[PDB]
């Protein structure tokens, strides 16, 4: 009972590309049927081949709300959208990600964490925005030297968003780099940042194999 993705790629499918609203997750499949750029808002999807290998055959697949939009993020605006992710002639964003911005001219220090109580592996995804100029780094995050730290029991990494004006893709001068990890049952993942964080909005718990 494999998967059928149609126009969407796994990058588009797993990130929640609004062009993929038709696709509903079924509990299991033996193998994925793609028709492969799926990244709505351009960027580098880290370990994309590694992720397609883990998602080849699954069981007990589930899509749950990991970080509620209207509570997990006090003192931060969460409704950040972009025209690169259009949805019926209107700007939108990934259906599984939140793009955190300033609130009242303030991006306070960030802290939040998730505990894997699903008793399965929880696939958690996030992104790192790489703006195109120093002016829009301050206007959205109020800090030139931003840091993002993702730490769990089995994965610890610290990102520094660098300001660089790349060639336009989807009519956008900046990128968002995508990253993921697997959270064991009973494990806790902790996000801390002060800017350029694309925090998880939903996540997937799954039995691999």
């Amino acid at each position, epitope marked *: 009972a494999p998967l059928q993705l149609g126009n969407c790629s796994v990058a588009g499918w797993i990130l929640g590309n609004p062009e993929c609203e038709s696709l509903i997750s079924k509990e299991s499949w033996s193998y994925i049927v793609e028709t492969p750029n799926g990244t709505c808002y*351009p960027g*580098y999807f*880290a370990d994309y081949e590694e992720l397609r290998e883990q998602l080849s055959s699954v069981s007990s697949f589930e899509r749950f709300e990991i970080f509620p939009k209207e509570s997990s993020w006090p003192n931060h605006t969460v409704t950040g959208v972009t025209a690169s992710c259009s949805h019926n002639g209107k700007s939108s964003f990934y259906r599984n990600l939140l793009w955190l911005t300033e609130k009242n001219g303030l991006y306070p220090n960030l802290s939040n964490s998730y505990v894997n109580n699903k008793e399965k592996e929880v696939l958690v995804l996030w992104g*790192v925005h790489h703006p195109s100029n120093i002016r829009d780094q301050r206007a959205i995050y109020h800090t030139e030297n931003a840091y993002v730290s993702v730490v769990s029991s089995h994965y610890s990494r610290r*990102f*520094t968003p*660098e*300001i*660089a*004006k*790349r*060639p*336009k*893709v989807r009519g956008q001068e900046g990128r968002i*780099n995508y990253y993921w990890t697997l959270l064991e049952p009973g494990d806790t993942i902790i996000f801390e940042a002060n800017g350029n964080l694309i925090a998880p909005w939903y996540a997937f718990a799954l039995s691999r194999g």
Partner: antibody
Amino acid sequence: EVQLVESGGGLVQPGGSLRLSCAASGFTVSRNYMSWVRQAPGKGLEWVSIIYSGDDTYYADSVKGRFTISRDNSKNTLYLEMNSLRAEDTAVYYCARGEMGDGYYWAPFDYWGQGTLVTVSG
Amino acid sequence: DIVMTQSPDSLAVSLGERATINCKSSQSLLYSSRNKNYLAWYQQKPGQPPKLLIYWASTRESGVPDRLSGSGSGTDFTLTISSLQAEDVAVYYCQQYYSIPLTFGGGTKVEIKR
């Protein structure tokens, strides 16, 4: 095979306008990075402008709003229409190429033109 | 505006000696995604246009001799001529195609002692 033939330079009075051309053969200009790089006499190299992908354009802040880059695919040519030329614009302008692969990352200037000189004087 | 700085401003060594051209960038030329350094090295003989010798900091283009090589990763990069020949007398610019404005270095004039 891959050449770049430039033409359009010469003498122009301050405030005058002038149009530079770059004839190409060996690669499609609509499918690679095309850049202008001027070099003031006895001074270092300086980038000027680019055009790429769906005719998106970047410029340097020193010539922005005054120069306009463009291209013509049926003629396989690069253009740099210059307006409101100033004395410090007196430089040999070069034609530049880059292998636009995925269009995500930039590329260097692998193939160059032989250079034409624009003198801003009256 | 990444500031590309070269060292020295003029290099004169004997034929067959060993010459190094050092280029320090105002910012890291590496990408968090992969491990490729967007720095390029160009040659400009007198009266000629520039000629790309090295891209991706280390990789050479076709037709470029083996004695040329580019090293470095991050903010510090180096062009080196192991056995300097006679036809190598030219100016060498390091240039970043990291971000835009694309900026070259000041230039390094290499000369032969005889």
